[PDB]
XYZ file of N, CA and C in Angstrom:
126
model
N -5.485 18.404 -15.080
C -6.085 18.904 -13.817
C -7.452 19.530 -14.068
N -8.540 18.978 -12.911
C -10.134 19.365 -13.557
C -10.416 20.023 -11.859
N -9.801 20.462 -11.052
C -9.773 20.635 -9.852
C -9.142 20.292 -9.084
N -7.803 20.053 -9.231
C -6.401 20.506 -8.001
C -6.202 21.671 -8.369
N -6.286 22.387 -7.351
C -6.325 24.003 -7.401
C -4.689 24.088 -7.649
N -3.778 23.646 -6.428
C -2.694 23.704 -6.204
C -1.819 22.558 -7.205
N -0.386 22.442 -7.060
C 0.238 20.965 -6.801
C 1.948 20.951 -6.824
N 2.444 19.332 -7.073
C 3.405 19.766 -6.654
C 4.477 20.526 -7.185
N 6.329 20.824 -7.510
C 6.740 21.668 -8.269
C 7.838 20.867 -9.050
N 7.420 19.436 -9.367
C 8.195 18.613 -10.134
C 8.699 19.320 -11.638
N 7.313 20.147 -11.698
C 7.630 21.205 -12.800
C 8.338 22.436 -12.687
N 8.112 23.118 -11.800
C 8.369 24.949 -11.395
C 9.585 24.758 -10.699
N 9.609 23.620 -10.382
C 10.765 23.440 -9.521
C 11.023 24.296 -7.822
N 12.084 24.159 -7.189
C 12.235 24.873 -6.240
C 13.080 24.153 -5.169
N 13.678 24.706 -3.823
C 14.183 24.364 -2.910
C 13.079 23.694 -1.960
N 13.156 22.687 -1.919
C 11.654 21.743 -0.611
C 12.468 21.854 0.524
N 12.162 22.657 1.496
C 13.027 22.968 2.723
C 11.984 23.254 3.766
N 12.177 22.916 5.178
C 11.103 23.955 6.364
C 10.345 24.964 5.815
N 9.314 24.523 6.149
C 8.142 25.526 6.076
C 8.615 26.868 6.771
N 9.224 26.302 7.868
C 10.318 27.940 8.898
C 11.388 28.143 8.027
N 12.055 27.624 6.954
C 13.054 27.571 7.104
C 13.552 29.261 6.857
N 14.600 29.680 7.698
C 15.638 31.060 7.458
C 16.271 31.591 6.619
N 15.854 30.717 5.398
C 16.925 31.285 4.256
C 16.090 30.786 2.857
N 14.808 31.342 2.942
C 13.541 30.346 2.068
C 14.308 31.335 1.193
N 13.268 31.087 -0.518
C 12.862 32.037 -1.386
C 11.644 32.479 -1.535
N 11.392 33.168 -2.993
C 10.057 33.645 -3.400
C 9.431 32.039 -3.431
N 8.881 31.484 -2.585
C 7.898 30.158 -2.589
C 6.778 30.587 -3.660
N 6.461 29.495 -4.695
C 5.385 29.759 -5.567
C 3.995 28.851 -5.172
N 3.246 29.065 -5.894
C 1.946 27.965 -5.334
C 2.248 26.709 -5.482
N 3.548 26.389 -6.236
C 3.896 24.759 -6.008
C 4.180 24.579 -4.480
N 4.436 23.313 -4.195
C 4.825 22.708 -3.338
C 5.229 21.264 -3.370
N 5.607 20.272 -2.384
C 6.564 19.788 -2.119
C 5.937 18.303 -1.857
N 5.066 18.420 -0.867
C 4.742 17.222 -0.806
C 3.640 16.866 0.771
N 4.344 17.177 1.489
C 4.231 17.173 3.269
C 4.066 18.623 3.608
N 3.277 18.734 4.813
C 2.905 21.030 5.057
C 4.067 20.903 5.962
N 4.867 20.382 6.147
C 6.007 20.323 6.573
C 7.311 20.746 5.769
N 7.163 20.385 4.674
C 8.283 21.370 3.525
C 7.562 21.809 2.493
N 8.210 23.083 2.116
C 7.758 23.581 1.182
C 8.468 23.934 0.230
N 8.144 23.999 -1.381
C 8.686 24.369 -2.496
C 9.126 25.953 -2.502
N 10.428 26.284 -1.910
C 10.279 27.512 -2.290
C 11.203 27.514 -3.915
N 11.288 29.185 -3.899
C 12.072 29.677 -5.401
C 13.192 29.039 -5.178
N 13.792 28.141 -6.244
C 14.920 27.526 -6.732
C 16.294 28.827 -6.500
């Protein structure tokens, strides 16, 4: 990486669930894929 600030959490891992979703975790700067789900804490 020479400038993706962000990316996804194939590594960090996490729950890819609603961006709303009610029962997230600590979400890290990974993410998921779509701004529609997001990588939160596993």
């Amino acid at each position: 990486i020479m400038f993706f600030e962000m990316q996804a959490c194939w590594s960090h891992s996490g729950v890819c669930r609603d961006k709303s979703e009610r029962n997230c975790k600590p979400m890290a700067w990974t993410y998921c894929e779509n701004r529609n789900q997001k990588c939160c804490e596993y």
